[PDB]
């Protein structure tokens, strides 16, 4: 299959839009227009002369154009009819918003839907989804938020309400998005198909998936495709049902059999996939992976103005199987030119609690420029002798002047001024977090992906 005309359609129909603007079909039509889609848009309604200033048709087959994608927002008892008309009209993708299929026990209706669509060479996304978004095509075919930040992250969600909520949350966490895809019941198109597309897609550099489960017989292909993707792009999976009780629970929300926890975990490892146990971890890691190259070696330096934060960092890294070694002697000499003699250079490098703003610039610069340093996590505890924003600007300037590209994460602990500084850094695509452990877990994800890519390279010869 080829999803080029799903993500970059020349013509999209919205079936189920209405004069009533509160209805979901209408919300989707609104989003499609406001987000700036440039192709042709065809509202489909049984009586409306026009909707949102656009000529409306009673059937897709009446549209004097070739429709690539039909977004279907009619009740389940009306879906099969629309599928037949769309099939007649030659539409390539049916994006079926509609709920009331396998997830509520109507397995047969769902299977009939897919077989009817396939009979016309038409593929199905969903059903029971909130739609999809593709930023490079200015395509917001969801009834979720109207806008997202632009960037290189594709987010696939098997969950409806959580997915659409997380779509909104990407904005709060400053995550730039290339795509949002609701896959819901996964009756046809699934994670494997989407990973195949995002693998090639130059607009997408990171893929995050909220995954409850995949279909029987589909796991081997999942590993084959995922592992190949992982050679070039990190995949983060939020696994729903990581525990026996969770797996049972999630199973009934979609009306499936509970999958083997242990075998899914093995499949992820074989695929080079990073499994996140929470939203927070998934987003923290995604941010870091989106904005940093992978470390080229293990010479990770931690820079801190307080031993406490440094210890918190050391412990967190160790929990992730990352152990620090002594810094290069050349870096120690460089930093000793402005640091007091009671500073620790064991790694973390403690520039002492009394460091002024300027030492963060000089320390960050010296580390990044050093040829025997592969990565840097910078930690900052607010005191009265510094300004959080001054420290933040010092880190920005050091990263520019170093002129290279090495992974960096930043932890800042303090009051409202620190919250502002962290935000400032993140709005410049420098991965910043309000605690040392989260900055360190974020750097750990860079090393985990480096190791995962290595796993897959070795596995594939």
């Amino acid at each position: 299959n080829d999803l080029e005309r799903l993500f970059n359609p020349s013509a999209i129909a919205v079936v189920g839009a209405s004069k009533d603007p509160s209805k979901i079909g209408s919300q989707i039509l609104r989003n499609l227009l406001s987000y700036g889609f440039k192709g042709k848009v065809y509202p489909i309604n049984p009586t409306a002369d026009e909707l949102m200033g656009l000529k409306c048709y009673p059937k897709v087959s009446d549209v004097p154009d070739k429709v690539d994608v039909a977004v279907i927002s009619v009740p389940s008892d009306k879906v099969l009819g629309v599928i037949d008309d769309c099939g007649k009209a030659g539409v390539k993708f049916a994006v079926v918003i509609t709920s009331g299929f396998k997830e509520v026990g109507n397995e047969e209706l769902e299977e009939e839907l897919v077989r009817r669509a396939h009979s016309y060479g038409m593929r199905v996304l969903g059903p029971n989804i909130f739609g999809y978004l593709y930023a490079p095509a200015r395509l917001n075919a969801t009834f979720g938020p109207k806008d997202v930040l632009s960037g290189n992250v594709a987010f696939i969600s098997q969950s409806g309400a959580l997915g659409i909520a997380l779509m909104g949350y990407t904005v709060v966490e400053n995550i730039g998005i290339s795509s949002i895809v609701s896959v819901g019941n996964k009756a046809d198109l699934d994670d494997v198909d989407l990973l195949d597309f995002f693998d090639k897609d130059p607009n997408t550099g990171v893929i995050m998936i909220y995954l409850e489960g995949i279909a029987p017989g589909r796991g081997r292909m999942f590993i084959d495709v995922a592992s190949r993707v992982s050679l070039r792009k990190p995949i983060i999976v939020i696994k729903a049902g990581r525990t026996e009780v969770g797996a049972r629970a999630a199973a009934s929300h979609t009306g499936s059999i509970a999958g083997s926890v242990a075998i899914y975990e093995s499949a992820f490892k074989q695929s080079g996939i990073l499994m996140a146990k929470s939203v927070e971890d998934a987003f923290d890691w995604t941010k870091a992976l989106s904005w940093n190259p992978i470390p080229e070696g293990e010479r990770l330096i931690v820079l801190t103005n307080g031993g406490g934060a440094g210890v918190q960092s050391t412990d967190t890294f160790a929990d992730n199987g990352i152990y620090l070694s002594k810094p290069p002697e050349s870096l120690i000499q460089e930093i000793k030119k402005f640091v007091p003699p009671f500073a620790s250079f064991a790694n973390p490098i403690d520039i002492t609690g009394m460091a002024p703003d300027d030492w963060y610039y000089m320390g960050t610069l010296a580390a990044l420029k050093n040829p025997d340093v592969d990565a840097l996590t910078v930690l900052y505890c607010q005191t009265a002798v510094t300004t959080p924003i001054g420290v933040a600007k010092g880190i920005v300037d050091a990263i520019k002047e170093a002129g290279n590209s090495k992974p960096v994460t930043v932890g800042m602990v303090g009051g409202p001024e620190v919250a502002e500084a962290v935000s400032f850094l993140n709005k410049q695509r420098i991965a910043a977090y309000p605690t040392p452990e989260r900055a360190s877990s974020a750097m750990s994800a860079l090393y985990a992906y480096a190791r995962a890519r290595s796993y897959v390279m070795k596995s594939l010869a």
């Binding site: 589909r218 075998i263 499949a267 796993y455």
Partner: protein, 229 residues
């Protein structure tokens, strides 16, 4: 074709290969097994033992006996003719008593493998992922603590090596009190081949190699079960 064994079993309404057939089958995939001489008489048992060399092991072979030790159907370290004869009769009587209605196919004669580190190698079929290889240390480590690793087949060398290092009891393979490190490469090779068995033979539902004895050099599958569907 080794597949004749599978076809014959299906034809006869059997749902498993018995030890000698299972060992023959996995042996044809390059997994090391024991000698497998099927003695029909106490006399044949003696002759086979002399050919194989002492010490030997005797085992019941019967469709109705899955757990052979539990019914007294296994005798090890038999070092002489008279001891073989004793064990032969001892097994027959144990089985007659514990499983009256058992079809006795015979008594399997095999070398007695010297002590080493026991492993388990398994094959199962997952609904999502298909044939999946399982690994763990023998005895309590899998059976009681459930310390196992899985890799979906086919396995790469990287898959095989990493799934071994993964189990909590891994250090039993790398040298401890009174025991040398064992041959990780031979284990990896067996794991890859177990995966290939699972990929290629669709009528195999499960395989259980329990135990596989690992040595500083090489391994030896000492018991084997193949379940059909």
């Amino acid at each position: 074709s080794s597949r004749d064994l599978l076809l014959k079993a299906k034809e006869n309404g059997r749902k498993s290969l018995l030890e000698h057939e299972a060992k023959y089958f996995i042996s044809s995939y390059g997994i090391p097994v024991t000698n497998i001489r099927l003695a029909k008489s106490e006399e044949e048992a003696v002759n086979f033992s002399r050919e194989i060399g002492f010490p030997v092991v005797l085992k019941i072979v019967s469709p109705q006996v899955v757990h052979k030790s539990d019914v007294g159907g296994v005798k090890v370290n038999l070092r002489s003719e008279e001891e073989v004869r004793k064990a032969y009769r001892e097994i027959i009587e144990n089985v007659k008593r514990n499983v009256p209605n058992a079809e006795i196919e015979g008594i399997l004669v095999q070398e007695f493998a010297p002590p080493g580190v026991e492993l388990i190698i398994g094959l199962l079929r997952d609904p999502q992922f298909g044939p999946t290889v399982m690994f763990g240390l023998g005895g309590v480590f899998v059976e009681l603590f459930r310390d196992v690793s899985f890799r979906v087949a086919p396995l790469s060398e990287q898959d095989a090596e990493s799934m071994i290092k993964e189990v909590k009891a891994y250090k039993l393979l790398t040298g401890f009190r009174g025991m040398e490190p064992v041959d990780i490469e031979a284990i990896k090779d067996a794991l890859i081949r177990a995966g290939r068995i699972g990929v290629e033979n669709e009528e195999i539902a499960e395989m259980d190699l329990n135990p596989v004895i690992a040595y500083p050099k090489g391994i030896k599958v000492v018991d084997a079960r193949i379940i059909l569907r």
